[PDB]
Design a binder for this molecule. Structure first.
Ligand SMILES: *[C@@H]1O[C@H](CO)[C@@H](O[C@@H]2O[C@H](CO)[C@@H](O)[C@H](O)[C@H]2NC(C)=O)[C@H](O)[C@H]1NC(C)=O
Ligand SMILES: *[C@@H]1O[C@H](CO)[C@@H](O)[C@H](O)[C@H]1NC(C)=O
Lengths: 29, 50
């Protein structure tokens, strides 16, 4: 909300999404 | 159809028997509530895109 004081209510902030740990590459055997 | 009502000031016309009928009216009241996350939609969880 870009504020130091937040009024009463419900607010949507972010996601439960995970950031990727590493990089995976796969090719035919 | 076509109907001619003969106007004449000597006469009125009043019906004798009355009926009761039921009709239907349909009215929308609301629609689907939606909400959009910015970065998940536009960038699809890319950090440098964010
Ligand atoms: C007004 O009209 C209704 C029909 O819309 C009449 O009801 C019918 O009356 C006859 C004779 O009494 C019956 O055989 C029928 O079964 C009745 N019903 C229907 C659906 O036809 C009613 O009698 C009329 N009233 C007056 C005062 O004329
Ligand atoms: C009623 O109708 C007749 C025929 O059109 C007309 O001559 C007469 O003047 C009318 N009377 C009134 C009071 O409107």
């Amino acid at each position: 909300l870009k504020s130091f004081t937040v009024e009463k209510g419900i607010y949507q902030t972010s996601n439960f999404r995970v950031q990727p740990t590493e990089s995976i590459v796969r090719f035919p055997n | 159809a076509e109907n001619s009502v003969a106007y004449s000031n000597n006469s009125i016309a009043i019906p004798t028997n009355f009926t009761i009928s039921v009709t239907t009216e349909i009215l929308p009241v609301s629609m689907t509530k939606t909400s959009v996350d910015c970065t998940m939609y536009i960038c699809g969880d890319s950090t440098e895109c964010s």
